Amino acid sequence: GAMGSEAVRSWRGAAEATSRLRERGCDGCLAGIEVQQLFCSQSAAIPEHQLKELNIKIDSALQAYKIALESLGHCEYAMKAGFHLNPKAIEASLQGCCSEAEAQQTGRRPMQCELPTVPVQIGSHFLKGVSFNESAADNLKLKTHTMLQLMKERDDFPVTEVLNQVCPSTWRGACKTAVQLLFGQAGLVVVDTAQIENKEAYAPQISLEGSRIVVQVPSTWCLKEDPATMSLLQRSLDPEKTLGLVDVLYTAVLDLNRWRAGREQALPCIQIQLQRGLQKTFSKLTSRF
Ligand SMILES: [Mg+2]
Numbered sequence: 222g223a224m225g226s227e228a229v230r231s232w233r234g235a236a237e238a239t240s241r242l243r244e245r246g247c248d249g250c251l252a253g254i255e256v257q258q259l260f261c262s263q264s265a266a267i268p269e270h271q272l273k274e275l276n277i278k279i280d281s282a283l284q285a286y287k288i289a290l291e292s293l294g295h296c297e298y299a300m301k302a303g304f305h306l307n308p309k310a311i312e313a314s315l316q317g318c319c320s321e322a323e324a325q326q327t328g329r330r331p332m333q334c335e336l337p338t339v340p341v342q343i344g345s346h347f348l349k350g351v352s353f354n355e356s357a358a359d360n361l362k363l364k365t366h367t368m369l370q371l372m373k374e375r376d377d378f379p380v381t382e383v384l385n386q387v388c389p390s391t392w393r394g395a396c397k398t399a400v401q402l403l404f405g406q407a408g409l410v411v412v413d414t415a416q417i418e419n420k421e422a423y424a425p426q427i428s429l430e431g432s433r434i435v436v437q438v439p440s441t442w443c444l445k446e447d448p449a450t451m452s453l454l455q456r457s458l459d460p461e462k463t464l465g466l467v468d469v470l471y472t473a474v475l476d477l478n479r480w481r482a483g484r485e486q487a488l489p490c491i492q493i494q495l496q497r498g499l500q501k502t503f504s505k506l507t508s509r510f
Contacts, residue, residue, distance in 0.1 A: 222485075224485065224487070224488055225306050225307055227301060228300070228302070228303040228306065228307070228488055229310040229311075229314075231299070231300035232310065232311055233314050234300070235300050235314070236314045236315070236318065236403075238298070238403070239293060239402075239403050241289040241292065241293070242404060242405075243318065243405075243406050244289070246281075246282060251282075251408055251409065252275075252282040252408070252409060253279065253282065253406065253408020253450045254408040255275070255278070255408075256275050257449065257453065259275070272454065272455065275454060276456065279409070279450070279454060279456075286406055286410055286464075290404070290464070290465065293495070295495050295496075296494070297492055297499050298403055298492070298493040298494065299490060299492050299493070300490075300493075301488045301489070302392075302471070302488055302490070302491055303489070304394075304395060304398055305328060305329075305330055306488075310328075311327050311398065312325060312327060312328055315327060315398070315401060315405075317405075317407050318401045318402055318405035318406070319407055320408070327394075331385050331388055331391065332381065332385050332388050333361070335388040335389060335390055336360075336361055336364055336384055336387070336388055337350070337351040337358075337360045337364075338351055338357075339388060339389070339424075340424040341425045341426075341427065342424050342426050342427065343364070343368055343427045344367070344371045346367050347509065348360075348363060348364050348367060349421070350421075364384065365380050365381075365384065368383060368427070371429050371434075372429065372477065374429075379434075379475055379480055383427065383434050383436060383473075383475055386425075386436040386438070387436060392438050392471045392473075393440070395489070396442070396469045396471055397412055399491045399493055400412045400442045400467050400469060403467075404467060404495070409446070409447050409450060410444055410447065410464060411444075412444060412445075413442065413443055413445060414441075414442060414443070415440075415463075422507045422509075423439050423441075424506075426506055432477045433474050433476050433477070434474070434476075434477065435473075435474050436471075436472065436473040436475075437470060437472050437506065438470070438471040438472075438473075439468070439469070439470050439502070439506055440468075441466060441467065441468055441469070441496075442466070443463040443464075443465070444463060444465040444466075444467065445460075445463055445464060446462070446464065448460060465495055465496065466495075466496040467494070467496065468494050468495075468496055468499060468500075469491060469492065469493050470491070470499045470502055471491050472489060472491075473489040473490075474486070474487055474489075
């Protein structure tokens with residue numbers, strides 16, 4: 222339908238907007254991809270001379286990536302989630318953003334076990350992630366009752382459908398894909414989760430606005446040199462170094478009038494911004510007690 226078409230154009234538009242991060246080398250290949258292919262073709266024994274040539278090419282690719290990244294500034298990007306709705310589209314838009322293997326798997330595919338460890342704020346109530354000494358079942362029961370009560374203020378309400386959206390198995394792959402579309406370069410720059418000091422500051426927020434349930438899930442990701450590529454090049458590999466930090470806000474809206482009318486719900490939205498209104502929301506979420 223039109224929702225799916227809009228989503229695909231949003232993934233294409235993201236990859237096109239930052240395509241300067243994925244420029245091919247002088248020999249027409251992405252340099253990191255060339256390194257990995259030669260490591261395979263040379264049976265893990267790249268001779269010393271080719272290794273130096275490759276390290277020189279990779280130095281230049283990393284310099285170009287950094288200059289291109291700077292040239293993008295810090296604008297807020299937006300796209301739809303929904304990658305599972307069109308595997309062929311997302312694989313096509315991820316070309317050059319991550320490995321061919323990871324692109325092939327991206328389109329292809331929940332709370333009972335994950336929700337207890339997720340801290341989440343429902344309305345005005347902060348609900349902790351379970352501690353080892355606490356009943357996970359009781360943590361779950363409190364979360365589902367608070368969810369239900371937000372709407373009552375069980376079987377008839379979409380409690381599970383909303384709470385599924387704060388489970389990492391639902392949002393985390395989609396957020397990683399968004400950051401890859403924008404900032405990845407296959408074989409050279411990879412996306413991973415950032416080290417968060419206070420997990421509770423990143424707790425998702427669930428709110429009731431009129432007849433709409435709004436789920437907001439914040440996260441932060443790092444851009445790093447591709448560790449396999451750097452290890453194959455016999456380079457100094459500091460796994461803690463980052464080329465940048467990227468803030469992401471995932472927003473899912475369940476319209477309760479559409480739910481009972483059986484009408485189509487909107488796809489989740491993803492907002493993305495390189496660290497130096499996503500920023501306003503980040504500051505509203507981090508300030509919660
Ligand atoms: Mg472009």
